[PDB]
Amino acid sequence: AVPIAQKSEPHSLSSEALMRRAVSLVTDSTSTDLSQTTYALIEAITEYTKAVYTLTSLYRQYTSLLGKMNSEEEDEVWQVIIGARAEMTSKHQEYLKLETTWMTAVGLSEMAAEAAYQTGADQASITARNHIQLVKLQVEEVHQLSRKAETKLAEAQ
Amino acid sequence: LPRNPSMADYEARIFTFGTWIYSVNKEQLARAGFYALGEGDKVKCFHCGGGLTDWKPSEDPWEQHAKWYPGCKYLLEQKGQEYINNIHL
């Protein structure tokens, strides 16, 4: 047997048209937001991590100077640790804010990918799916490096 | 899914109460899913994103998460529905 050659119905439900364009506009909009938010989040985690190991080194030094310092000095070292602590906190706060935003962008990108899949747009589907995949990979890795630094700060406490 | 997966760990959350000047217990707060926001006694749940302030001397953090944010799925996973329901009575 051979397939039946056909064609006649336009397959024109307004809903069909709206749904297909919606899928395309949204996959693009989420692509944009995912890249943009992933960059901002990674950058904030990197800046936060810097604030962490800075405080870690401040502690390692203060610990090294235990005894060697005297009254005023021990106090001056501490004011620096106080200001450093505050910096790390502010960077942490910013990083958590952007982590939530990235979570939304990722969720929204997955929605679009699934929709493109449902509507048969495999190309847009796979691209977005591969993109989400990469972005998740990189953000997990930077977070892990970030945990390493946090552990060393703790150990230095 | 949590709003802040990075704070899904207890140790991550308790690390935020390093310098806590309030009587509300920080281990209990961290156990109930909260991490300090770094201002006042403001805390927020890593999962539902719910924030609480103005704590009282002897207050139960889990009691307060169930009170104010009964819909938190971290809360029911840890305390169950009857617990949350009892709080709403």
UniProtKB/Swiss-Prot annotation, chain A:
A motif (IAP-binding) lies at residues 1-5. It comes from Homo sapiens. The chain holds residues 56 to 212 of 239 of the full protein. It comes from the Eukaryota. This is Diablo IAP-binding mitochondrial protein, cleaved form. The gene is DIABLO.
Curated annotation (Swiss-Prot), chain B:
Changing residue 59 to S: Decreased interaction with DIABLO/SMAC and with HTRA2. Decreases interaction with HTRA2. No effect on interaction with SEPTIN4 isoform ARTS. Residues 7-22 are annotated as: Required for interaction with SEPTIN4 isoform ARTS. This is E3 ubiquitin-protein ligase XIAP. It is linked to Lymphoproliferative syndrome, X-linked, 2: A rare immunodeficiency characterized by extreme susceptibility to infection with Epstein-Barr virus (EBV). Symptoms include severe or fatal mononucleosis, acquired hypogammaglobulinemia, pancytopenia and malignant lymphoma. Multi-functional protein which regulates not only caspases and apoptosis, but also modulates inflammatory signaling and immunity, copper homeostasis, mitogenic kinase signaling, cell proliferation, as well as cell invasion and metastasis. Acts as a direct caspase inhibitor. Directly bind to the active site pocket of CASP3 and CASP7 and obstructs substrate entry. Inactivates CASP9 by keeping it in a monomeric, inactive state. Zn(2+) binds at residues 45, 48, 65, 72. Changing residue 55 to A: No effect on interaction with SEPTIN4 isoform ARTS. The first BIR domain is involved in interaction with TAB1/MAP3K7IP1 and is important for dimerization. The second BIR domain is sufficient to inhibit CASP3 and CASP7, while the third BIR is involved in CASP9 inhibition. The interactions with DIABLO/SMAC and HTRA2/PRSS25 are mediated by the second and third BIR domains. It comes from Homo sapiens. The lineage of its organism: Eukaryota, Metazoa, Chordata, Craniata, Vertebrata. Monomer, and homodimer. Part of a complex composed of SEPTIN4 isoform ARTS, XIAP and BCL2, within the complex interacts with SEPTIN4 isoform ARTS and BCL2, SEPTIN4 isoform ARTS acts as a scaffold protein and stabilizes the complex. Interacts (via BIR3 domain) with DIABLO/SMAC; the interaction inhibits apoptotic suppressor activity. Interacts with HTRA2/PRSS25; the interaction inhibits apoptotic suppressor activity. Interacts with TAB1/MAP3K7IP1 and AIFM1. Interaction with DIABLO/SMAC hinders binding of TAB1/MAP3K7IP1 and AIFM1. Interacts with TCF25 and COMMD1. BIR repeats lie at residues 10-75. S-Nitrosylation down-regulates its E3 ubiquitin-protein ligase activity. Autoubiquitinated. Ubiquitinated by TRIM32; leading to proteasomal degradation. Expressed in colonic crypts (at protein level). Ubiquitous, except peripheral blood leukocytes.
